[PDB]
Amino acid sequence: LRCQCIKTYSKPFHPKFIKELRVIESGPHCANTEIIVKLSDGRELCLDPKENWVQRVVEKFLKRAENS
Amino acid sequence: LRCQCIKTYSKPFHPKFIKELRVIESGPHCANTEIIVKLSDGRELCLDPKENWVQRVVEKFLKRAENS
DSSP states (O other): OOOOOSSOOOSOOOGGGEEEEEEEOOBTTBSSOEEEEEETTSOEEEEOTTSHHHHHHHHHHHHHHHTO | OOOOOSSOOOSOOOGGGEEEEEEEOOBTTBSSOEEEEEETTSOEEEEOTTSHHHHHHHHHHHHHHHTO
Protein backbone atom coordinates (compact mmCIF):
# COMPACT_ATOMS: atom_id res chain seq x y z
CA LEU A 1 0.00 0.00 0.00
CA ARG A 2 1.08 3.58 -0.60
CA CYS A 3 1.10 6.12 2.28
CA GLN A 4 -2.00 5.69 4.45
CA CYS A 5 -2.02 9.04 6.19
CA ILE A 6 -3.29 12.24 4.53
CA LYS A 7 -2.66 14.19 7.79
CA THR A 8 -1.76 13.62 11.43
CA TYR A 9 -3.70 14.34 14.63
CA SER A 10 -2.08 17.24 16.47
CA LYS A 11 -3.70 17.37 19.91
CA PRO A 12 -2.37 15.22 22.67
CA PHE A 13 -4.78 12.65 24.15
CA HIS A 14 -4.69 9.90 26.70
CA PRO A 15 -3.31 6.49 25.78
CA LYS A 16 -6.42 4.82 27.21
CA PHE A 17 -8.21 5.77 24.04
CA ILE A 18 -5.97 3.55 21.91
CA LYS A 19 -6.76 -0.08 21.41
CA GLU A 20 -4.48 -0.82 18.44
CA LEU A 21 -1.21 0.60 17.13
CA ARG A 22 0.37 0.10 13.72
CA VAL A 23 3.88 1.47 12.93
CA ILE A 24 4.95 1.14 9.23
CA GLU A 25 8.60 2.10 8.58
CA SER A 26 9.29 4.31 5.49
CA GLY A 27 10.42 2.46 2.34
CA PRO A 28 9.58 2.39 -1.34
CA HIS A 29 5.87 2.37 -0.51
CA CYS A 30 5.81 5.67 1.45
CA ALA A 31 8.61 8.10 2.16
CA ASN A 32 7.40 8.59 5.71
CA THR A 33 7.19 6.34 8.66
CA GLU A 34 3.49 6.23 9.55
CA ILE A 35 1.83 5.61 12.91
CA ILE A 36 -1.83 4.55 12.71
CA VAL A 37 -3.88 4.08 15.87
CA LYS A 38 -7.37 2.55 16.19
CA LEU A 39 -9.27 4.28 19.03
CA SER A 40 -11.56 2.59 21.59
CA ASP A 41 -14.57 3.49 19.38
CA GLY A 42 -12.99 2.07 16.20
CA ARG A 43 -12.04 5.37 14.49
CA GLU A 44 -8.44 5.56 13.24
CA LEU A 45 -5.96 8.45 13.37
CA CYS A 46 -2.39 8.98 12.15
CA LEU A 47 0.19 10.38 14.55
CA ASP A 48 3.49 12.12 13.77
CA PRO A 49 6.31 9.88 14.91
CA LYS A 50 8.58 12.91 15.38
CA GLU A 51 6.39 14.58 18.02
CA ASN A 52 7.54 13.97 21.57
CA TRP A 53 3.94 13.59 22.85
CA VAL A 54 3.27 10.85 20.26
CA GLN A 55 6.36 8.97 21.35
CA ARG A 56 5.13 9.21 24.97
CA VAL A 57 1.62 8.03 24.12
CA VAL A 58 3.02 5.06 22.13
CA GLU A 59 5.27 4.06 25.00
CA LYS A 60 2.43 4.23 27.57
CA PHE A 61 0.04 2.29 25.41
CA LEU A 62 2.73 -0.37 25.00
CA LYS A 63 3.46 -0.56 28.76
CA ARG A 64 -0.23 -1.02 29.39
CA ALA A 65 -1.07 -3.52 26.68
CA GLU A 66 2.07 -5.51 27.42
CA ASN A 67 0.86 -6.53 30.88
CA SER A 68 -2.77 -6.92 29.76
CA LEU B 1 -10.98 -10.51 14.12
CA ARG B 2 -10.35 -13.19 16.72
CA CYS B 3 -6.79 -13.87 18.00
CA GLN B 4 -4.30 -13.76 15.13
CA CYS B 5 -1.42 -15.61 16.73
CA ILE B 6 -1.31 -19.42 17.02
CA LYS B 7 2.19 -19.20 18.59
CA THR B 8 4.98 -16.71 19.24
CA TYR B 9 8.56 -16.57 17.97
CA SER B 10 10.95 -17.38 20.80
CA LYS B 11 14.44 -16.53 19.54
CA PRO B 12 15.71 -13.02 19.81
CA PHE B 13 16.58 -11.25 16.54
CA HIS B 14 17.73 -7.86 15.43
CA PRO B 15 15.22 -5.04 15.04
CA LYS B 16 16.58 -4.28 11.56
CA PHE B 17 14.58 -7.21 10.32
CA ILE B 18 11.27 -5.55 11.20
CA LYS B 19 9.58 -3.22 8.81
CA GLU B 20 6.11 -3.10 10.38
CA LEU B 21 4.73 -3.54 13.89
CA ARG B 22 1.13 -4.10 14.95
CA VAL B 23 0.12 -4.15 18.67
CA ILE B 24 -3.54 -5.17 19.34
CA GLU B 25 -4.62 -4.79 23.00
CA SER B 26 -6.64 -7.69 24.53
CA GLY B 27 -10.43 -7.24 24.57
CA PRO B 28 -13.52 -9.22 23.67
CA HIS B 29 -11.90 -10.29 20.40
CA CYS B 30 -8.84 -12.03 21.95
CA ALA B 31 -7.92 -12.51 25.57
CA ASN B 32 -4.29 -11.74 24.85
CA THR B 33 -2.52 -8.67 23.71
CA GLU B 34 -0.88 -9.64 20.42
CA ILE B 35 2.24 -8.25 18.77
CA ILE B 36 2.52 -8.95 15.03
CA VAL B 37 5.63 -7.93 13.10
CA LYS B 38 6.14 -7.96 9.31
CA LEU B 39 9.80 -8.77 8.52
CA SER B 40 11.95 -7.16 5.79
CA ASP B 41 11.08 -10.09 3.47
CA GLY B 42 7.32 -9.81 4.11
CA ARG B 43 6.88 -12.84 6.42
CA GLU B 44 4.98 -12.14 9.66
CA LEU B 45 5.65 -13.38 13.20
CA CYS B 46 3.92 -12.95 16.56
CA LEU B 47 5.99 -11.93 19.57
CA ASP B 48 5.19 -12.36 23.28
CA PRO B 49 4.63 -8.94 24.77
CA LYS B 50 5.71 -10.22 28.20
CA GLU B 51 9.23 -11.19 27.12
CA ASN B 52 11.86 -8.61 27.98
CA TRP B 53 13.71 -9.15 24.66
CA VAL B 54 10.49 -8.43 22.71
CA GLN B 55 9.96 -5.22 24.61
CA ARG B 56 13.57 -4.22 23.75
CA VAL B 57 13.18 -5.07 20.07
CA VAL B 58 9.91 -3.07 19.87
CA GLU B 59 11.51 -0.07 21.49
CA LYS B 60 14.54 -0.14 19.14
CA PHE B 61 12.43 -0.55 16.05
CA LEU B 62 10.36 2.44 17.19
CA LYS B 63 13.45 4.62 17.87
CA ARG B 64 14.71 3.80 14.41
CA ALA B 65 11.52 4.21 12.42
CA GLU B 66 10.62 7.37 14.31
CA ASN B 67 13.58 9.30 12.88
CA SER B 68 13.31 7.65 9.45
